[PDB]
Design a protein around this ligand. Structure first.
Ligand SMILES: [Ca+2]
Ligand SMILES: [Ca+2]
Length: 87
């Protein structure tokens, strides 16, 4: 999955600076919300959950998620591609 996670990172890094800052993470969260709603889940209190998940993925507390954090998380503890509806 590491090459899939790297491919997907590059799609959300719209300014191509190699990190996902807050507004780009926010886009990722909204896509995960749209996937959940599409499946007709109850999304009432899902968004605070997705935010805290992404806070944790920022391992070094930089306010941004680097490619290595994104890949490390998506390949070990969190099914990022499933949540985005990509897998
Ligand atoms: Ca960026
Ligand atoms: Ca970081």
């Amino acid at each position: 999955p590491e090459d899939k996670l790297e491919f997907t990172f590059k799609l959300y890094d719209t300014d191509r600076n190699g990190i996902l800052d807050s507004s780009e993470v926010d886009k990722i969260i909204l896509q995960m919300m749209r996937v959940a709603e599409y499946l007709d889940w109850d999304v009432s209190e899902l968004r605070p959950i997705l935010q805290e998940m992404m806070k944790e993925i920022d391992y070094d507390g930089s306010g941004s998620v680097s490619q290595a954090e994104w890949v490390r998380a998506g390949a070990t503890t969190v099914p990022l591609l499933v949540l985005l509806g990509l897998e």
